[PDB]
Design an enzyme around this catalytic site. Structure first.
Site, PDB file in Angstrom:
ATOM      1  N   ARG A   1      31.731  36.961  17.023  1.00  0.00           N
ATOM      2  CA  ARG A   1      31.128  38.279  16.710  1.00  0.00           C
ATOM      3  C   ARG A   1      31.389  38.664  15.258  1.00  0.00           C
ATOM      4  O   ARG A   1      30.685  39.549  14.773  1.00  0.00           O
ATOM      5  CB  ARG A   1      31.641  39.337  17.686  1.00  0.00           C
ATOM      6  CG  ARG A   1      31.402  39.013  19.152  1.00  0.00           C
ATOM      7  CD  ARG A   1      32.244  39.946  19.994  1.00  0.00           C
ATOM      8  NE  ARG A   1      31.446  40.763  20.891  1.00  0.00           N
ATOM      9  CZ  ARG A   1      30.701  40.283  21.877  1.00  0.00           C
ATOM     10  NH1 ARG A   1      30.709  38.989  22.144  1.00  0.00           N
ATOM     11  NH2 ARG A   1      29.956  41.101  22.600  1.00  0.00           N
ATOM     12  N   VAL A   2      32.387  38.083  14.604  1.00  0.00           N
ATOM     13  CA  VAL A   2      32.532  38.326  13.175  1.00  0.00           C
ATOM     14  C   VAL A   2      31.417  37.630  12.413  1.00  0.00           C
ATOM     15  O   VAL A   2      30.714  38.246  11.607  1.00  0.00           O
ATOM     16  CB  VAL A   2      33.912  37.869  12.687  1.00  0.00           C
ATOM     17  CG1 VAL A   2      33.971  37.966  11.198  1.00  0.00           C
ATOM     18  CG2 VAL A   2      34.984  38.717  13.302  1.00  0.00           C
TER      19      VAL A   2
END
Ligand SMILES: Nc1ncnc2c1ncn2[C@@H]1O[C@H](COP(=O)(O)OP(=O)(O)OP(=O)(O)O)[C@@H](O)[C@H]1O
Ligand SMILES: Nc1ncnc2c1ncn2[C@@H]1O[C@H](COP(=O)(O)OP(=O)(O)O)[C@@H](O)[C@H]1O
Ligand SMILES: [Mg+2]
Ligand SMILES: [Mg+2]
Lengths: 466, 187, 477, 456, 128
Positions: E118-119
């Site tokens: 998700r980063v």
């Protein structure tokens, strides 16, 4: 200290001591029995009452019966005077040859070796079995675990490892029968007598046997594993030898814990096992280890309930083993034996820096081709065999040949099969699988490889096929 | 073995021991005797010395019950009272003793016909109207009862009077009246 | 009195909480005032839990409960032979009282390691498929496993009937006394089975213990142990006994019921944690005793019913892990007419190959090899292999309630695997066999007698067999 | 004995007695109600308290309400006067026709017959239905799982079985409606009134009805099967007949048992059924058997939950089934009536040692020729067409005009005995009638009428 | 410590399934009410108040960080169990390993389909 019996629930006895409450893990004797009956203390229920697991049958107990504290855990006789004998969980000789005149007794509960004592040496242990040595090779001092459902070949495999390793062994050897068939114990005793390993007439026996079998109440089945551990621990620490320890079956230890845990008044965890499953298995399995003061090579059969390989007991045991050999029923029903699953067995020494780059590449190639065949399985099953690519047909043929070749007849399986047991050295296995991978035998029928020794016997049979 | 049940029932281990003693006493006609001796042994087991010894969770059950026998036998206890005492002790039910006694008292509060009733009003009352009210709410009763008046005063009801006699309950306060007004006029 | 007598505090869930009995022992048979009997299971600091061996309806609260002072036992001895008793050893065939004079505890332990000896003597089942490919020896535990209506009880009944040819002879070393424990079957089924055995004249040496489907779950849980004790009697006196638990799935179900009404943690498929010890402590008592203990033995044939042919269930795998082999009775084979529908590919006897006779081994090692080839093939030679295999499977099919002596079976398998049927029509093989048998029972009594007495096949006997089968084959269709 | 209600939780009522506790499985009459409400004892809780399940709704029960013990389990009125009437789980007439004036009553909780009373040989029950008596015979005293639901003529088959058993064997029938939709209960009642099975005007009714509907507390739905079984038990023992006992449905009997268990707080078994599933079914089914007086032949409609035969309820009721009668819809669309599937209908007396080698051979031949006919129809010659012709004539001959439908089509009723069925199918397989047209066998009795129709 | 003193750390719990099993034993023995798979009710709290301590401080707190790589062992690839789904819902993306890819020669057997971060690209160098 002298207490009395206030509750009897199956294999769990609650006794109320007046004064001198015995610590946990102590052994109590029940007064008024024809044969010795030992209770091991498990809890302190308050009101100077303790809960205990019996070590034998509990019929005939009456509320108010006297109980004497021994002031120590269950102590078993240890030493070289235990070789060639058969003791039960509490250390009584049950071979009807008189008492075990040894010098010292050891307690069956002890602390696991510390961290600084652990050894990290990883020499290979050549068993002579093709699939084991090719894909999941064992290590000296490591822990080996043979998983498998009911009737897939765990006991035959252990008898084969005893025939191939416990005979050419230098150190001593222990066999702990934890909840298994009693006739198997009788057959093992006599087969070891005849083969000269157990010598009943002099003091040159090389094996000590412990036996609490599947006819024993859950206390005995829960602690006989620890008894065998204690014997092996003496032979390792106090003599610096090289010990072998064959446990069969180790799942019965956890199962006995589960049978008793319901009555100890505990909330059941998942599936139905005790909440303390993992830590119990840990305090047992951590004693079975090679330290730097000795070495214990352990082979432990591990039952798998309803073939569920995700059952908490084997799924918890997996982390405790250095090399696992997972027998499968889908393979035994193909006629292949041993029924090792080549795609589920692993080992910590399958590393190119240990077994050599050649062995590693061969093993990985075998696993890869078998995995590709397993992927093709459904297409082959539905859309026929002659709808594949030519390369795919090549891999299918080679993979079926490898499947057959991985099987091998055993010297202990020649009683109900007739074939002659083989012992394939490591070099022969590596060479044969190198050659089959390279397609050097795509002309022989796959049927030529079923139940042979090395590749020489494969081609000899293939010629005999005509 | 047949048991005679009291006309009012209490539950829990308190109620079980209470009705056990009620049956054990009504089978030898010692109700008032065991009742007074129960109240007195309750006072005894609440003086700080023994009231503190009885609940120590380590003092052995045998030694505790023996010491308790030593203590009760000096007051010339009838067999039934010390029987109940030893039955509670050998069962580890001593911290509940007073409760049982309390329960038992309430049982007698029904054997004598004592009907507990409450008349709650805004302000405290003078005893002329209180006595005529005793007469009034005594008229409801059947043959052979006695009545226990426990009147309290709450200005939150802004007047009127609430008569909760046993289970019957009349609400003549101005509060429920004005709630009736609100709900009826709004609907 | 509160030491040899109790009062029922609360009956329910098939358990009676009883007050009193300060002198009762664990696993002691108490007797309720209703005539019922029960086992003192739980001994708690204030009350006793008693398992009721019957209908709870017969018990009220406050009923006095006496104690018998004896741990739960059953009457044993030769007096039981030819009697139909229930799980408590009470005659339910209306033939008077059981004249037994000794009793045995149902909850004994199995003999240890030393009192045993490896299995060596044959246990002739009379079935060609069993005796040839799944040999069972006296002292083994062979598991008959398969779906509903596949032929398990029929196999057991054929075995019990076959033992008749030995139980009329002379040497007491070959006789075999049979016991058939019925666990949750329809009672009409057991009545018809008893009649079938009476007609075959096999009751004179058989006991039938029936805990049928209408009996309380504790009776179905106890019946196997009554049977095993009645068998242990014969085993411990140098005699030989066979016992059939029909079946263990229903005893496992009864024990699960008893365990859930006691509020014990259910495991896989809601079975109690000790559903394995339940069967292990029972199937371990079937042993072969060495000569210093009598030489006797006890053979157990536990029956197991699988759901949809699933053999990797909980209880099936438990019993597979306890016994010394199995006999897979498939249902697809049973549908195609193959009877007994033994999946000889999956059936196995680990300790039986040492129990075959010499002659049966001489023909059966062969027959097993060719059947293995026939199964692994399903060219010019493989067509021969397939044809010989088809003939052999057609030869393995057998009637019902007609088990064959060992000499007849070895003669038939001999005629089969010696190629002498490789030209006949498969669908006729059966009849041929039948006809063949009659001939050999008429004109070759001496050959059968010497194959029997010798227990082997000598070269003279082999040549006589070859000439005999060829003479009969030429004079055939 | 007079106790009082001390607790009410839905359908579970705890009743305390002062003296004289009633044994388990006794009936208790709740005093002071408009309609009769019977509680059945299930446990002895202690302190002289019993726990009970209610046979009817427990609305309007007050703690301390008096309860009278009856000193016996639920006693229903039995006798021939039950014939044609309807009664609920406790034997009250729910047909609005007055009381059931019988002479004797009987408790619904009895024990299965002794071992010495069983019948030692299995014998066939002749139902006069060709396909049933040929391909899947009914064992006298055995349980028969009748599959198939709506639009396959199930109720017609039920009424025809009733009629045939009454005419040939002289034994009545009982229909226990365990967990029935009330709409379907009424539909079946009226269909039985029309077809002459029930007769509201004389003393010649054949069946006695017992209804426990879908909207009753689980105790009633669990015990109604025992009520019907008690009526049939009277007909078997005291009259010495060959009774039929229809149980529709049986899966709803299992479900009622499971609900009764869950209400009493027992830990559920596997899947979700009661821990006493097999024992409940056993104590029910072990009464349906043959004795030295008569017999009881049960026909039970089986519902398979989530079409899974390994489910505990079908797996447990299958152990008691001696036969099976599968009604397919495809066989109905093909104009075959009864729509009994010929291949799927199995039996356990299809055994030469029982039905005789002759009957077994004829039935095996019919099954074989029908299987070969299906395998041939898979494709769509020399004699394959001969098998096809004989198989079409077999299919046509399996049908039969039921008397219970005379009012519809006017065709007569044909109760074909076993000898004539055997002989007819033997002659059809031997090829004796290879020349008649295949339509000469549609809706015919014996083969004689087949050739008679072949004339025209 | 390192996170709060300007340095960067990297912690690896190996694994969390066994910590959850230990906590389940402690709970069931303490008579706490069990939940799914007999786990206690607040095992999610147990893993979250631990995995949340892995932060990246700003330059007003030294700038240090603390990266966590919790490990999770699933039973036959069942990522819909209790503890797997809890730790999946807690973390910032997964690295799924399979055995079918492990024996197909793909080692490390990372299943790229199901693996997410998700980063994302913000946690890469420019070139990569
Ligand atoms: N070898 C055979 N030859 C002919 N018929 C057979 C044979 N074996 C079984 N049968 C018949 O098939 C049926 C099988 O029933 P059987 O009792 O023998 O097996 P089962 O496993 O015990 O069935 P169940 O689960 O109902 O107890 C029987 O009616 C039997 O008569
Ligand atoms: N190497 C083998 N060759 C042939 N059959 C085998 C072999 N190993 C096992 N089996 C089969 O497995 C059976 C016994 O295996 P076993 O180890 O006793 O099962 P379990 O895991 O329950 O101990 C044998 O009877 C045999 O049929
Ligand atoms: Mg094993
Ligand atoms: Mg059977």
């Amino acid at each position: 200290a002298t207490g009395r019996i206030v509750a009897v629930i199956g294999a769990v006895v609650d006794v109320q001591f007046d004064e001198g409450l015995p610590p946990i893990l102590n052994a109590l004797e029940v007064q008024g029995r024809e044969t010795r009956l030992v209770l091991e203390v498990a809890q302190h229920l308050g009101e100077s009452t303790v809960r205990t697991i019996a070590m034998d049958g509990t019929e005939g107990l009456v509320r108010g019966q006297k109980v004497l504290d021994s002031g120590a855990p269950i102590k078993i006789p240890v030493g070289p005077e235990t070789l060639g004998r058969i003791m039960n969980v509490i250390g009584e000789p049950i071979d009807e040859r008189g008492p075990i005149k040894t010098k010292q007794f050891a307690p069956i509960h002890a602390e696991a070796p510390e961290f600084m004592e652990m050894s990290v040496e990883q020499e290979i242990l050549v068993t002579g079995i093709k699939v084991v040595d090719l894909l999941a090779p064992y290590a000296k001092g490591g822990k080996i675990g043979l998983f498998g459902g009911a009737g897939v070949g765990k006991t035959v495999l252990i008898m084969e490892l005893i025939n191939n390793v416990a005979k050419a062994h230098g150190g001593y050897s222990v066999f702990a029968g934890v909840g298994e068939r009693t006739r198997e114990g009788n057959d093992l005793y006599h087969e070891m007598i005849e083969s000269g390993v157990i010598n009943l007439k002099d003091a040159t026996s090389k094996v000590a046997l412990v036996y609490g079998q599947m006819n024993e109440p859950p206390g005995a089945r829960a602690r006989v594993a620890l008894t065998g551990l204690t014997v092996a621990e003496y032979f390792r620490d106090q003599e610096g030898q090289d010990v072998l320890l064959f446990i069969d079956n180790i799942f019965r230890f956890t199962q006995a814990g589960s049978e008793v845990s319901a009555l100890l008044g505990r909330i059941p965890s998942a599936v139905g096992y005790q909440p303390t499953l993992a830590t119990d298995m840990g305090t047992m399995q951590e004693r079975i280890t090679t330290t730097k003061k000795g070495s214990i090579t352990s082979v432990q059969a591990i039952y798998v309930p309803a073939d569920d390989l995700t059952d908490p007991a084997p799924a918890t045991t997996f982390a405790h083993l250095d090399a696992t050999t997972v027998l499968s029923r889908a393979i035994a029903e193909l006629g292949i034996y041993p029924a090792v699953d080549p795609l589920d067995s692993t080992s910590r020494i399958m590393d190119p820096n240990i077994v050599g780059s050649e062995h590693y590449d061969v093993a990985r190639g075998v696993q890869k081709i078998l995995q590709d065949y397993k992927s093709l399985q459904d297409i082959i099953a539905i859309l026929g065999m002659d709808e594949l690519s030519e390369e795919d047909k090549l891999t299918v043929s080679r993979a079926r040949k490898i499947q057959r070749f991985l099987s091998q007849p055993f010297q202990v399986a020649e009683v109900f099969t007739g074939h002659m047991g083989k012992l394939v050295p490591l070099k022969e296995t590596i060479k044969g699988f190198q050659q089959i991978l390279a397609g050097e035998y795509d002309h022989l029928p796959e049927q030529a490889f079923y139940m042979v020794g090395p590749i020489e016997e494969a081609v000899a049979k293939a010629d005999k096929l005509a | 073995a047949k048991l005679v049940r009291p006309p009012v029932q209490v539950y829990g281990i308190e109620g079980r021991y209470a009705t056990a003693l009620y049956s054990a006493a009504s089978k030898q006609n010692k109700l008032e005797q065991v009742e007074k001796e129960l109240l007195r042994v309750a006072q005894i087991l609440k003086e700080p010395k023994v009231a503190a010894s009885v609940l120590n969770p380590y003092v052995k059950r045998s030694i505790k019950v023996k010491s308790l026998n030593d203590i009760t036998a000096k007051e010339r206890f009838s067999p039934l009272t010390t029987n109940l005492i030893n039955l509670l002790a050998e069962n580890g039910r001593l911290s509940n003793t007073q409760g049982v006694v309390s329960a038992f008292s309430t049982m007698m509060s029904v054997h004598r016909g004592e009907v507990p009733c409450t008349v709650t009003s805004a302000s405290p009352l003078e005893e002329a109207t209180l006595s005529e009210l005793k007469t009034v709410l005594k008229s409801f009763l059947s043959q052979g009862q006695v009545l226990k008046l426990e009147a309290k005063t709450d200005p939150s009801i802004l007047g009127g009077m609430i008569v909760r006699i046993g289970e019957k309950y009349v609400d003549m306060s101005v509060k429920t009246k004005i709630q009736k007004l609100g709900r009826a006029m709004r609907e | 009195d509160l030491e040899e007598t109790g009062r029922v505090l609360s009956i329910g869930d098939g358990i009676a909480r009883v007050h009193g009995l300060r002198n009762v022992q664990a696993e002691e048979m108490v007797e309720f005032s209703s005539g019922l009997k029960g086992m003192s299971l739980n001994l708690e600091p204030d009350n006793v839990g008693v398992v009721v061996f019957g209908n709870d309806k017969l018990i009220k609260e406050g009923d006095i409960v006496k104690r018998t002072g004896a741990i739960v036992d059953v009457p044993v001895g030769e007096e039981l032979l030819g009697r139909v008793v229930d799980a408590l050893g009470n005659a339910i065939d209306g033939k008077g009282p059981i004249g037994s004079k000794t009793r045995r505890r149902v909850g004994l332990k199995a003999p240890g390691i030393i009192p045993r000896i490896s299995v060596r003597e044959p246990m002739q089942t009379g079935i060609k498929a069993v005796d040839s490919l799944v040999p069972i020896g006296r002292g083994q535990r062979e598991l008959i496993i398969g779906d509903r209506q596949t032929g398990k009880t029929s196999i057991a009944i054929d075995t019990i009937i076959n033992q008749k040819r030995f139980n009329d002879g002379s040497d007491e070393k070959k006789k075999l006394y049979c016991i058939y424990v019925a666990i949750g079957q329809k009672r009409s089924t057991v009545a018809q089975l008893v009649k079938r055995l009476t007609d075959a004249d096999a009751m004179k040496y058989t006991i039938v213990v029936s805990a049928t489907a209408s009996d309380a779950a504790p009776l179905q849980y106890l019946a196997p142990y009554s049977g095993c004790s009645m068998g242990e009697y014969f085993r411990d006196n140098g005699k030989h006994a066979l016992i059939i638990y029909d079946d263990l799935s229903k005893q496992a179900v009864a024990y699960r019921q008893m365990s859930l009404l006691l509020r014990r943690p259910p495991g896989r498929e809601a079975y109690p944690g000790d559903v394995f010890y339940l069967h292990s402590r029972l199937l371990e008592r079937a042993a072969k005793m060495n000569d210093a203990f009598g030489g006797g033995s006890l053979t157990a044939l536990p029956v197991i019913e699988t759901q949809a042919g699933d053999v990797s269930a909980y209880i099936p795998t438990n019993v597979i892990s306890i016994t010394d082999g199995q006999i897979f009775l498939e249902t697809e084979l049973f549908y195609k007419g193959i009877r007994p529908a033994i999946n000889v590919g999956l059936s196995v006897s680990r300790v039986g190959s040492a129990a075959q006779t010499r002659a049966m081994k001489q023909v059966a090692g062969t027959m097993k090899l060719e059947l293995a080839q026939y199964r692994e093939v399903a060219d010019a030679a493989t067509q021969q292999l397939l044809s010989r295999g088809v003939r052999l499977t057609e030869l393995l099919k057998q009637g019902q309630y007609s088990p064959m002596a060992i000499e007849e079976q070895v003669a038939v398998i001999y005629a089969g695997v010696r190629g002498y049927l490789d030209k006949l029509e498969p669908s006729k093989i059966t009849k041929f066999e039948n006809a063949f048998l009659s001939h050999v029972v008429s004109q070759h009594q001496a050959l059968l007698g010497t194959i029997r007495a010798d227990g082997k096949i000598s070269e003279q006997s082999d040549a006589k067999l070859k000439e005999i089968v060829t003479n009969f084959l030429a004079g055939f269709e």
